[PDB]
Structures are given as structure tokens and as C-alpha cells.
Design a protein around this nucleic acid. Sequence first.
RNA 1: UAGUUGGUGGGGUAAAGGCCUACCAAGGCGACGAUCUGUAGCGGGUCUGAGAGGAUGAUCCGCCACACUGGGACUGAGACAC
RNA 2: CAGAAUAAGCACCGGCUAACUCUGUGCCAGCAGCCGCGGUAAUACAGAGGGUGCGAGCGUUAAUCGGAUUUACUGGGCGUAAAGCGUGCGUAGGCGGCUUAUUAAGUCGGAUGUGAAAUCCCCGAGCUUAACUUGGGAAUUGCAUUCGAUACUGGUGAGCUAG
Lengths: 79, 82, 155, 207, 130, 122
Amino acid sequence: TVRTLTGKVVSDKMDKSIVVLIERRVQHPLYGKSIRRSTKLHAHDENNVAKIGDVVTIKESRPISKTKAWTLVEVVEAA
Amino acid sequence: MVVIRLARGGAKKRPFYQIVVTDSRNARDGRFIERIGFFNPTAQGQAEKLRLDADRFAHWVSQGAQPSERVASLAAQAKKAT
Amino acid sequence: LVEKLVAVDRVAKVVKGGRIFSFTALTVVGDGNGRVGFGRGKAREVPAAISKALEAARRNMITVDLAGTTLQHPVNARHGASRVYMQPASEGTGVIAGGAMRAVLEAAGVHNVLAKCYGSTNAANVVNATFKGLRDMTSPEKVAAKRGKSVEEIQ
Amino acid sequence: ARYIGPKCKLSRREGTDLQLKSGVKPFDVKTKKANKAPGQHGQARGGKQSEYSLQLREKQKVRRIYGVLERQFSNYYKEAARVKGATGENLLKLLESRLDNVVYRMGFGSTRAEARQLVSHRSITLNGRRVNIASIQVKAGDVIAVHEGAKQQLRIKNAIELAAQRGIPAWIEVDHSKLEGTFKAAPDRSDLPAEINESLIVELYSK
Amino acid sequence: SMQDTVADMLTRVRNAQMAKKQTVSMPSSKLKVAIANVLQQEGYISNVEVAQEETKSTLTITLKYFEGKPVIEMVKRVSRPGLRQYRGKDKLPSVKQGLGIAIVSTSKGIMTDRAARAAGIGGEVIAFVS
Amino acid sequence: ATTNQLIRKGRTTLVEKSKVPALKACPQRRGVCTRVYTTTPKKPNSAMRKVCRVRLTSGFEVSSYIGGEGHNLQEHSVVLIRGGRVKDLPGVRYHTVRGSLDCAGVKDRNQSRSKYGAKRPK
RNA sequence: UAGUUGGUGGGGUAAAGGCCUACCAAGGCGACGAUCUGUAGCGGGUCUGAGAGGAUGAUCCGCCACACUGGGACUGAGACAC
RNA sequence: CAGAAUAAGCACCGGCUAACUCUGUGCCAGCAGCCGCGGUAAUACAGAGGGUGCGAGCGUUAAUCGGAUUUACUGGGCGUAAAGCGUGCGUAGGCGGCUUAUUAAGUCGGAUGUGAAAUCCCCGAGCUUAACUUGGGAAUUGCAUUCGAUACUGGUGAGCUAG
């Protein structure tokens, strides 16, 4: 039951890596308005299957580099 | 090692002990793993003197914990009581 | 009948050679069972002003629908720059309010309420605001009647 | 501590008889100055008073009759507020349930002050214990008895004579020959006199 | 531009009541129809009609007066596009100590606060009426 | 403001400064008298009031009013000062406490003695 | 921001990892506040308040860092050791 | 066993604020949190009498919150009191007309795990009472996983004409 997060690829320049932008929607602690929030996560894709614009799913893993600790699972939607 | 012993509490001249399972390196009245009873040396009236949980006592003793001498004596007292 | 002297004040007008000085009085009169009124009276003497205020308050009266010794629902009222909030309270709380609001509430007959004043605390305006709020309070029976439903259905 | 001072000055100031003179003569005959305050500027009771003034005089009136200082009175009021039910009535129940006041209402003390001294000197016993605190609250079912040393006392004999002259309250039942009585429950508000007003005190503390 | 049709409908009802008119007409939508049906079933308004010509539908509401006064004394919009209000079952609002109604959008449909409490569900608070 | 405006920027709260900066959040302060003088109150009051210039341990030279009928303070006197405003002498924001390190209580007083430091006369 | 961001071979650690190193590529972060600068041990709790909130971290408990100032290792299950 | 024998001070009395008079003194001495009092009949200055409120304590200074709806989420304002940019266009952002199908992100409901102990509150027990100590419960208003609902908001496909 690995934790899974779905996002969309935003970069593919690096070798065997992709960068995916993940967005969440939460209420403001004081005023209650629903507001947008986003985070950028580095992932590992050995075969360079994913590219910029596609929707992907990633899971948590052991560290693979200084900044990468997530791995590709499937390409949900091809660009 | 893991031990079962008495942590002090209450007021001056009238201590009240918690029977706790803890790592021997922790302080007497500090960090502990589990609380499994109490001991009131000067109980009077309706106050209960000794309450020890035999199931947890046996479990921890089986897991390698070493009781102190006072706790062993109290466990013997509780065994006689029940 | 319960009679309360909310306030008395000294006022002046300018004339040749000096000042003409008079007194004004604000008073409230009620029965304690749910009828209340307030009035103002002016005169060159306090005894006369108070009496005129008493007559004015007697003339200006209304009826109020109470819930035992408390209000039917929380109420917000205003007159000019004076705002008043009143909330029903459980038995034993008492009347937690200011003097101006307390006079009107005692005259009406409410003995359990929590009241707050926001804005100007002018005695006459606060009395007017409390008066209008108490007058405009509704009741479960009236709400059911105007909705066309039963009181039990209204709950 | 305790308030040691003239009693009739305070009684006249309060405007009503506080019942601190044992009632052997009429209070009016004893003081012959009621309705006039003690002082150079003492004025008749008809003088007007402020709202805060009345609120304060009510608390002072209760405190003077029951011999309780301000700190203990405030603790009593806070306790009554915590306790469920009408806070004003609970406060009066708390005052009535005092060991020395219960001894007075049970009839072995000529005055509440005398009962205080009896308790302090250990001439009274709660159940089988030689208590010496007047602030003790007597719970339901308690037995206020006299001590052997306290028995065979001329003061106690005169006190029981005065009690017989008086009327024993219903909730207490005391055998004078055995010099011991028992407490059923807290006297009800209806039983308590209607002269005292508690709402003024509740507002005083609420302010 | 127009951005809150529910608020527009509530405002039209309020101003018609204040002007003492017997009927009020407006462009129709299914959400407005649901709100009007809830008001009618709670007794604030008499009748609700929808009339379609080619593709445009008009909602018509009949208003009630009692004792020479509007039956709807107070109507307020709670949740707006700028700020959206969602409440759980425990924290549902009460209007005038239960003498009014709070209209609630829940997964089971549009209902009042007391009915929502009975069902043990929450949702979006739309309006207060009394 | 609107909800969006409040989200983008919040509500601003402004702090308040201390009316007694010389004390530096202390109930009292030791000092050394630098000059004892008598000044004239501002209108409409007319009188002569005794003030002193003091170098505090904190480091701020300050003016201290002296209360009571009689004062024996002179140059090079170690005194103790506290908060308090005369309300009619500009620039005076402190009092000197009597009965302190070098100050003495006021003689021939029997009312409000705890103030002015006079001890109990028999 | 130029070991900087990622990859391959090798080194190293009880253990993942630019942790180190040779080469390869030009990446990586930032208006959702990067970089710089000021201030500060953090939580359970405590005070105040109808509540929302505001102020706060003595005494009790958990975690962190430090031992005249700075740089180091040794021994040992465990220290870079009042 | 001895005997009332060993034991009560501090502040205040013009209004806010419960308690007033005499003397001495006079725009001096002085009092003063604010409005203020003081040039010979000052209940506001010093003493005295009498009182008032506390009490082994009573006053002052220092500091935080409250009153303060004077930072307003709950819960404020911009014609003349403080406050609409000299006027447009437009980027990021916020919000956005009607119908229908699908999704279940927001939203809502259920279950499991977790939210240490102490502290707060509730019912009891031991302290002559109370403080205090203590047994149990509630609470910890949150976070995570999972299974469900589809009215509203958002995503997707399709259709429409009042913008």
C-alpha cells in the first residue's frame, strides 16, 4: 500500500528524471475560503517514458539522488 | 535493561508509587514505556493499597524485563491476594 | 406600577443678558407582566419635568410576548447610532445588561437575559432601541399562524 | 482571622436586628437607637441609596449574621456558581450547613460566637471525632453530640434552657438530656427567612 | 456582469415583498425551482410556476401577506461565490431559535436544517429565511 | 476589505511603546542625584515644586519629582525612583520614594504614613 | 545557484544518498516570496477572554543544542565525551 | 497542670466609587489615575473626631489580557467627520450564463489506527476541614488509511442563446 500521488509532468530535461507539479485545494485557517496550493516533486523514470505535458502517477521509495525520492508508476494521460 | 519499578509521586511524608515498565537508563520520575499499577504505602479507610495487572506483568516478564525487589515482593503479595 | 427614572439632565439656551436654564428627564413605566413604555419631560424644575415624563411614558405603551421570564429568540435592534443585542438565558442567570437597558427589561418583566450595547450609549437612543426590539419580537404561535402551519409542526 | 468588635454598632448600621445579642431582652429595648445610624452624621434609614450601595449592603448583612470574612464568602459564592441549580439558594445552603451555625440552630450555643468558641475548644464532636474547626460543612445524616467535659457545665445548662425557650428547627432533632442531635438535610429556601435577598449578591459578584 | 443567480432571485423576492406586489417573475433554473419548492412546502409562498416559450423558461412565484405584512420578514444569502460556507451535521445553523429555516444543499437534495439534522448529513448553507 | 484582499494581505496591528522607558520594565530603579531644584508649575496652577536630575543605572538621565513637605536630599545622594506623573510639571515622569537608600520619611505625619515612609509613632 | 541539478564507472559508511571523486549533459530554485537581512530553543501546557482570538514557555514532562573560545580525532556496543 | 493569661495593623471618606465634620492654613504649603481643589465660611492641603472597606496583612510601582465592534473571520468604515488612484488599456490572480452525460478533487457520512503521561472538567477516596494527593471517566474540537453519497463548486465530453 505505497502512498501514491498523481500530477502532471512539467520537465523532462534531466536524464532518467521527471519533475511533476502537484496541486491541492484546502480551506484558509482564518477566513475559510477555498484556496489553491501546489508543490513540485522530483521523480525517477529509468526508461524516460514520460515527457512534458503528460499526467503521471508516482509512489514513494528510498532515495535515488540528493533530491529524488519518488518513482513513476504509470502514465495516466499522454500529452 | 528493561525493568519494572516504582516511580515516586504524591506529597511530602506521603509517597504514592506508580508501578512502571521503563528502560533502566531513564530517570526515576521521567520517561516510561507503560504504567501497570500503583502502590499506596499509607492507605486508610476505603483507599486501595495495591493494584497490579498480572497479564501485563507476565507479558513483560516474558519479554525479558527484570523486576526490582520491591516489585517482586508486591507481585507475591498480589498473587496471595488473588 | 413599576416606575424608573432613567436619567435627568440640565440644559441651557442663550438669550440677551444671560442664559435660560431648564431640566429634562427620561423615565420608564411598566407593570412587570409584559407592558412597558418610556417618556421624556422638560421643565424649569426637576419635579415638574419628572412628572411630565411620567405622563408621556404612561401614554406611550406597548405589549410584549414573553417566554416565561426570557425572550423568545435572540434579537438585534438599532435606532440612529445605537445598536443593542439581547439573548435569552437559562433560569438563574439574571439580567446582565446596562442600566438603561435594565430599566426597560425590568419594566417589561424579563428577569433572565444577556444584553450587549454596540455604538453610542446615549440613554434615550438605547431605550428606543430596546423598546423597538422588544416590540418587534415574534412568537411561536404567531409564526405558525402566519405560515399557516401548526405550532407542533413549526417545533 | 476573626472580627472582634462591637456588635450593636454593626447591627444598627445594617438597619435590621442581626440576632447577635442572644435575645434575652428585646433588641429594641437593648439598643434604643435603631433606625438611627451610629455616628456624628448618622441619618434615618429613609435616606436614599445607590444601586451599588444596596448590592454591597446585602452582602455585608449576610456576612455579619453568619460571621464569615470576605475571602471565605467569595469562595462560597464561586462554589455555589460551580454547583448546579440556583446559585443564590446554594450559597445560603452552604452558609447554613456550617458546623458552628448548625450547632447554633441545634441549640447548644447561646450565640453563634459561643458555638464558635465551643468548637475551637473541642467541646463538640462530629460523629465520634473531636473536631475543632467551625468552617466544617455538616453533611446529611451527621450527629452533633456534646463531649463529656462539656457536659455538666452551667453555661451549657443555661444555653439549653434558652434553647427550650426557643423553638427547635424541624430539620434538626436534638435530645437535650443526651445532649446530642442529628441533621437530616439542608434547610429549604422556604424554611429560610424571606428577609434576605440573594439576587443582589449574585449581581454583585457578577459585575 | 451577473455572477450570482441565487442571490439575484432572493433579491427580486425581497424587493417585490417590500413593494407589496402579488407576483414575481424571473428567468428560471432547476436550482431556483428547488429553492422555491422548499419555500412553498414551508409555507412562505403560495404557488410556483414555470413557463417555457422556445428555449427560455420563466419562474413565477405568488407572494403571501398576513396581517397586512409580508410573510417573509427576513431573507439572507449565506454562501456566495466569493466565500463558500460548508457545515457538518453537528454545526448546522439555527435561525431565530428554530423559528426560521436554513436552506441546505446536501447529497440527498435540498432540504431544511432540521430535516438535515434528522437525516444526519451536512452540506452547503444557501440562505436564511424567517 | 474583501475576502480576497484579506487573504492577499492581512489585518495590521500596531504595537504600543512604554510610558516609562527609563525604568526598562523594572518596578524601581536606583539613581544618583545630579541636581536638586525647584520649578514653577504650568498654568493655571501656581506654586513651587521640587524636582531632581538623576543618572539611572540604566543610563538615561531623568527628572524625578520629590514628594512631601520636607526633603533633605542634596548633591551626590543615592536614591530610588519609581513610575508616576505629576500631571502639571512638563518633563517629569517619575517619583522618588521616601524612606529609601538615602531618602528619609516625612516627619510629623500620621495619615498615609506607608506612603512617604514615616514609621509608626508610638 | 557551478558539486550547483541529473546520469555512468570507481571510492566510502552499520546503512539510502554529490557523502567523495573522474567523465558526461546543462541543469536546479524563485511572486505559492528564492537569495539577503532582523529576531528567536520548540511542544504538552500556562494567563486572559462568552467565544473567536491575543500574550506567553519559571517551577512538572518529551525533544533539541551546548560545557573558557576555536579545530580534531582516539577508545569503546554506544562520545567526536560538563 | 497554670491562667484571659503570650498576640492587629494598613488604606480611604468631591465625581467615577461605600463612608463627613471641626480645626490650622490660604493660588503658599500642597493633593492629583482623569475631570479638578488651594487668594481668610477648601466635606479635594496638614492634624483631630467619627466613619467605610480589608485583615496577619494593607497600599504603591512594574508587566499581560479585558473593557476596545480603536485591525471588525465571528464583528467596522471611504458625499461633508480619517479614507475612491487624474483617467483608460491590459499581464499574473479572483470570480463567471443555460441544459445534459461522466468523474468523485472540493464537500458530506461510516469504520479502523493514532492523538504519551501530567494539566482542564465530572463522579468518588485519603487528608479533623480546605488547600493538596489520588482512582476512574470524559476530553484531546486534529491527523492518516479505507468504504460509501452525488444536490452544490471544480475536471471532462456534448448541446444551446437572453451575456
